[PDB]
Assembly symmetry: T
Homo-oligomer: 161 residues x 12
């Protein structure tokens, strides 16, 4: 038992209220993006429908895994996520997705904007998150990388060169 600690209770790392708040911000925008992505997935029509229909689902898959990652990271650090519809609608920074069928060209522009809004939130909280807990900042890097890839894969459709 030469280097063994003799403490009965050893407590875990606990997130500050600011840290908890910062992850909550990322969480709602990821959930909103997932909901908007599905709306777009269902209602997109027109030229190159199928590619967009499929890509939007991949976006949703990524944003859903992201939300679970962030929420469970909060839980791990003794913070409490709120992913409820009312909270998401009232607190998301994403511009509202429009109703009804939308052209593929419209959907490309709309969804690129909403991905970029989500990335902006993560980028905005990054430094404060990193200063408190570098391990969580690494989860943010995964999200930034994955989402910016989605934006490129989606926006390239509308690029005229």
């Amino acid at each position: 038992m030469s280097a063994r600690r003799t403490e009965s209770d050893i407590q875990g790392f606990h997130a500050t209220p600011e840290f908890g708040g910062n992850l909550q911000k990322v969480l709602v925008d990821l959930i909103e993006l997932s909901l908007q992505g599905k709306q777009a997935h269902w209602n997109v029509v027109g030229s190159n429908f199928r590619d967009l229909h499929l890509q939007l689902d991949e976006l949703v898959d990524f944003a859903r895994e992201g939300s679970d990652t962030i929420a469970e990271r909060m839980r791990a650090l003794d913070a409490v996520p709120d992913g409820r519809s009312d909270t998401v609608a009232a607190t998301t920074t994403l511009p509202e997705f429009p109703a009804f069928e939308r052209s593929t060209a419209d959907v490309v522009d709309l969804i690129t904007t909403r991905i970029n809004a989500t990335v902006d939130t993560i980028r905005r909280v990054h430094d404060a998150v990193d200063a408190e807990d570098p391990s969580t900042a690494d989860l943010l890097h995964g999200l930034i990388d994955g989402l910016e890839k989605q934006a490129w894969l989606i926006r390239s459709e509308n690029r005229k060169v």
Copy 2:
């Protein structure tokens, strides 16, 4: 030759009432999935792991359910609305509470909200079936799957 002569054969299109009925089912499935994840993350206490896991299975089912309904709407020329504001403003499910909740409370809460979701589907069933029996089969799969989830979750709290 029995070949038809038309160059533009149109498909079955749903009435506004039918589309509205599927929209009702859609928002409650989306709401259930969001509440399911909330519960999944925030449940604590005796038998946490089983409940944490079962709730993810519920969410998986409700998400594929929502996709099925929304895409059935699209197939029949209806237009789904699964946006957060719409879901919040039009869902019939009792609001799930914020914060950590005990496994026993989560069992009771989620069972109620699953039953609320099944109730929506059962309420619209006959009107859906009358117009399009094929869509009612999709509703049957939902009723079956969700009622199975209700049983698997609620049994935790049963007395004898």
Copy 3:
């Protein structure tokens, strides 16, 4: 603004005693079919042994999945299944499978008859089940379809010209 319900306790659909009894009838015949299917699977000998040996196992798989589906549907609807050996033996409508080895030709006829009997139970309770709960009748349709396919695949061995 809000369409949210306000009850703290919302109850699930509860099957009538009659409905429960009807599903119980299906259950015992499916279990009996599974047990007879294995008996036949072990004890068949003669011309085209292997095919029947293999097909019988597929029948047993389907009947076992079937019994679990029915029993769990009962549980979902607050009914209580009884799949115990004594109950199955005492209440199954299937003719007893004979003892010892049986020829491929005999097993074909015997098992086809027992599938037909199992399906007849499902068809007999169908309308009463459908009237109370259309979602359960759909599970019955899957059973009817899957079992009648098994009957075709098995019986065709003995069909001539």
Copy 4:
């Protein structure tokens, strides 16, 4: 004690009218698969690849469907006929044109062919359902899957 004592119990036999109704579904599903492959090979132009791929998924679904219907016929002791001459002579689908066809034309052509196939299933539905509800459920699966394919394909040409 509840055991039935007859040595041979007969199964459910389809009437010949039922058999003929499923035969109508079968030939159109087969025709659709053959037309689907024709389109899959010969489609050219803007968004070729998506169409090429989606057409194969349609064919996969129609082939599984024709197997399902033919085997259901056999299960009920009806006898299917999926031979080329019969399919050509009795299909209700408009003929697919020869040669390379643009993606836009293929979209419209195949949507029409799918809609014709669904129409056949919808036309026989009630007579099939009246004799055998379990078979009608298979028809529901086909209606659901084909109408989904129609939506996935036609959306390419939709202007909003």
Copy 5:
């Protein structure tokens, strides 16, 4: 040159006593599977899900086991009897009770049923081993797997 020259070489035949010993194992394995499913459906209460799941794993093991024993009988030209009437009439397992049962009760009941099944295998072991060591190895696999299941289930009720 070392080749045997007889046209038919006979295989190893089990004595009827050996066959009867394996028959004893078979009925108890089948009874256990049927009781296992009964418990799996009807268990309710604290830690429902773990028990529900573990009971299915037990049933899987007992079903594979009964197949192994019945097929070993056939390999040695014995003839198994796994029919409902025979199983009910000849199983050594205490009857499983009807109705919903609490998780605590199910734990104790099933542990007893597993232990009865293992006892049968242990009881016939030496007579089986004396005639055919290869069959005794299958019995060892069953003893090992069932006693593992007994430990996994009973641990739920263990107070320390």
Copy 6:
């Protein structure tokens, strides 16, 4: 320094009308074989039903993969396949499959004959195809090999002693 070609447009290999017609002949017989294979698969009854039922589906799988290979090879070489039902019926060299149920023994003989006919078409066009395009003849070799294996696996049911 550099071996780079400087043309901005380099054309692909274009099949002659004769070559296209030869592959078209293969195509229709493969599709016809697939259709007859399914007919036999559904409608075979009698001794050893299951084996033939199963083997026929493997034949259909191979013939379907075959037809796609040939049709796509045509497309690659700027030829245009015709796999429509009317064309297949009007131009196939296979004897018509008879209607209604057929015995296992009859199905064995019938299907073996139709595979033999399909292979004969491929063998008949082989040398002309090989002369123009050796790479396409290799695809023909795969078809010949795979189909003659199917013929062996099917026909051996009826071969005595």
Copy 7:
């Protein structure tokens, strides 16, 4: 404090020459069975061809896995296997498989006899093997079990009523 052994060289279990010879006897019969199994698999014709064709390949798979197990067990215990064609032919106890095509019925009887012979070798050496090394006898039990199952699945074709 410490129960650690202090030898720098600890030797493994070394089989006696007799033990090695006993496993060699098993080995040659397993290889011979594999070779005869393939011969039968290629050359069987007649009623229920496909089932026997398929089952024979499963037998060959088991016998091949068996020969590798035995040969490697020999190697583990510092014995040296001989699986060369000349040795197998010169020392196998199996009756020779006859040449050319054989009927399904004949193949059933022939192969059953050869499995019985293979198992008899294993049963003959069993007690001597078990006495020296119980762990090796367990591998023998797996072989006996798996081969006698093959014999049942094959022979049952010819068993009447």
Copy 8:
């Protein structure tokens, strides 16, 4: 060869003795945690046994992959791990796991404490590791994230709310 280096030997990044020491600290606590996790996995009894039994194995899987990651990172950086039992026992910071059967409630508290001790070690060395080699700090972030998730999944069992 315009930007090509012309050096025969190009050496890799080598860890300082301090860095090597820091990774060694993480290594022994990960190994100790794996050994304690297995002890808990085997000996846990009581209410919710199965969930805990299963979760503890997932913990062990993660801690074992972690130890291999750390040890091989050491090797990559020309450092030498010591994962031997004596070294692990003499140098681990984890409180000793108690002997005998332990209740699920006890195991939850015990294992949460030991996970937290392991995380503390990683958190303690993090800044020094990051200052020398950011790529290795990222491996530490994976470990922190994964272990703190395990702690949350385990400790939630004992939480009374």
Copy 9:
């Protein structure tokens, strides 16, 4: 005994001309794969996703192709050279341009470069076949696969 008596049986070795012919194929396959990735990354515009995806499939095929040829060279005692300087200095493919390129331009560019690669293989085919028919079969697989890729890519730009 028909057993051969030699202790050192040597294998087939390729002529310098043969090795040089396979080297020609090798550099064009490597170049195609590098250009394929360049296009995959830098393509933009209408139907980006389909082209992005198809180009990766082309690259996959060309990379396995290059490995096949280089390893066939090794089997026959030839020595491949797939180094960047060698590929750049000896490839027959027109250089792929830098920077972003439209999907329409990428279709035309990549089709030309696939055709250039096929041309190399077709040019060396007869000399390869004359020496070693087994290697010509590998060439046939390449011609078939690449010409399929050309068709799948170029069809995007087709008019009617």
Copy 10:
């Protein structure tokens, strides 16, 4: 009815001697796995990769082995102790050295330590078999697997 009447049928429980014998096997398997990983990480020199890989396969086998034994102890009401202090203080294996070691030295070292582990199992075998033949079968699997590992590792150092 042959049904047993007992409500509480107990399972087979091991003697203290038996539990102690399995404990002996357990600590040597755990020690072998720790030494296996040490060797896996620290081996260098000629044929490094093969040895690195084989040692992981050894570790995999020893870890599943330790779990099998410890869980067999639990099934029979024995209590394993796999803690680091216990393993270090009670293992019979010669200590594996620290630091980098050549492949040739690693081969010799690991072979010795595998043989030490097999020796433990062989030493306790008869006493285990006498009490519980089913557990001896688990020991046979261990002896077989580890002796296979010894052969695969040691053959590297063999002379002719």
Copy 11:
């Protein structure tokens, strides 16, 4: 209308000379597999594991090959003979030596055995190709795969 009207159309029959040519390939492929396993078991020394593993891949390939050839014979109504006595009596491969052999010796021995097997295939190639080009393609696959194995194995002994 283009339908042939004969009731039985005969398939392609191999001449007996063709059959005998494939028989030559078959026995050498079988001999190679048996020698491959002999080597796989008995190889010892430096780089044991790589050789042990590579020899099994060779055996896998040769076994698939012998099946391919024997089944091609059957497809064309030739009748294979793969019996031990026939293989020993008619194989052209030099006998594999008894006992343990060093990795260096095994490398050289097996390379020779592979080269002998390839020589047989190359020797019959033109006669096989003249009668049936499709069979020659199978021979090409064998030549390609075996010569790859020869390169992978012999490279171990190559000094540069």
Copy 12:
């Protein structure tokens, strides 16, 4: 819409020309390494050929995935990769791989050097990349970690202790 942004176009993060240049440097060395790895894979001969042959392919797999990661990260950040053969040859920092067959000992030393050169490039640009975009630095950490592991796995072959 309480926190919702009301902007039509929200732009993504764009890499500076320096950042783009820095990723381009990493890209060419990863591509060069993949090409050299394959050259080595094909042409390596001598003692322990197979292990090296196999390890070199794993290296190539990793370097190819790396190049795609870097290139697509550039695309995501509105930078434009150049992976063309001429560019790679003219701008790589890796010493040229020699022609012809090379001994396993030679290949080990050669490839270790070239991996180390590639790692050096990534390490050289790391701080500038991290300062501008921490999410991209994390991708570099993956590359450093993965490549240094390959170097250790390859170089250990030549280590004499």
